[PDB]
Amino acid sequence: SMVDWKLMQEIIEAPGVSGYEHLGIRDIVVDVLKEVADEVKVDKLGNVIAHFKGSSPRIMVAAHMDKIGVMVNHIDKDGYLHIVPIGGVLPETLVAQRIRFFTEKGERYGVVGVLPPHLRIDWDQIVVDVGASSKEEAEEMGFRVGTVGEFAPNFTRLNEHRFATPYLDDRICLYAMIEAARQLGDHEADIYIVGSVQEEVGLRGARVASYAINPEVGIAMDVTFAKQPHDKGKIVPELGKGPVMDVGPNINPKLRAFADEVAKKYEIPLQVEPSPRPTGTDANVMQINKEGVATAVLSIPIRYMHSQVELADARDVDNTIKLAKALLEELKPMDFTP
């Protein structure tokens, strides 16, 4: 298990909003997995699919490579950018923030300004300043209709265990899945490790990857909500209390019971999240793939999801790596029929 802070930060900060995972994260995932997998391929949507050959059952584990972000809708006559969200970016988190754009002339920053109080929440109030003085100048700088951008990186390690940064969702789980894969010992299962694309715009990469792989078992590794201020006591998982595994309709009872047994065997703390609906993770589309798949969700709890200050606890990451590795190594043929 054990957290490699340098690799983890590299995986978090690599470029790749939904539909543009090829801008950086994809090559990193391919390179790290090619060293340990029997075969790694990239499909037409950009999913990275790494095969660790085994016997049975066939399992697909998916963590998504894409980040939420923004796209330039148009550039105005004074050289300001008007942007729209890619995935669940909320306008409130954009005020007085830096955005990292992927322009024709490399990575370039812009800022979302604020109007001083004496001149006075929605997308129309959001205008990006890139230091340009005209539309022509912004265009010469490399900005275009369709230019995409991300929250600017800011990795903050607060103490021994806690850290805050944009894009723990889902780079922290992609990191954990990749570490589990690198540490993977012998296993009976036929394992596909998938870096999925476009999770944040409707689970689109995992949909096609599941179709091609045709797994019997599916596990999505995505982040989940942790107890935090103003949550009204409604959130069950807490930072530092371990990986989280949902229960509910998206979650095969036999697979979820198997996961409990494994967690107990390896003495890994395991939290329960009640999910009464099909989840908002790749496991949603994996479960209803083709003839149906036995699915579960394995999550790292974070605070402040979908903002620049997503915050996690490295003890949870470590234990998630350990649990993913143990599930993959312990998995064996069994009857998943509910």
Binding residues for Cl ion restricted to 209-228, rule: CB under 5 A: 214
Q: Which of residues 86-115 bind Cl ion (CB under 5 A)?
A: none
Sign (positive or negative) of CA dihedral 129, 104, 8, 283: positive
Catalytic residue among 199, 273, 310, 329: 199
Among 216, 222, 316, 329, binds a copy of itself (CB under 8 A): 216
* Centroid of chain to Cα 301: 12
- Catalytic residue check, 199: yes
Instruction: Please state, in angstroms and rounded to a whole number, the distance separating the CA atoms of residues 173 and 32.
Output: 15
Q: Residues 202, 249, 64, 332: what is their CA dihedral angle, to the nearest 10 degrees?
A: -140
Sign (positive or negative) of CA dihedral 234, 285, 288, 221: negative
Q: Which of residues 237-296 bind a copy of itself (CB under 8 A)?
A: 239-240, 247-253, 272-274, 276-278, 287-294
Residue closer to Cl ion (CB basis): 79 or 87: 87
Q: Which does 82 bind (CB under 5 to 8 A by kind): Cl ion, Zn ion, a copy of itself, none?
A: a copy of itself
**How many CB atoms sit inside 10 A of residue 29's CB?**
27
Q: Which does 51 bind (CB under 5 to 8 A by kind): a copy of itself, Cl ion, Zn ion, none?
A: none
Smallest gap from residue 279 Cβ to Cl ion (A): 10
Q: Which does 210 bind (CB under 5 to 8 A by kind): Zn ion, a copy of itself, Cl ion, none?
A: none
Question: Cβ distance 141 to 133 under 8 Å?
Answer: no
Q: Which does 214 bind (CB under 5 to 8 A by kind): Zn ion, Cl ion, a copy of itself, none?
A: Cl ion
Question: Cβ distance 49 to 40 under 8 Å?
Answer: yes
Does 199 count as an annotated binding residue? yes
Cis peptide before 170 (omega within 30 of 0): yes
Any idea which residues carry the catalytic annotation?
Answer: 199
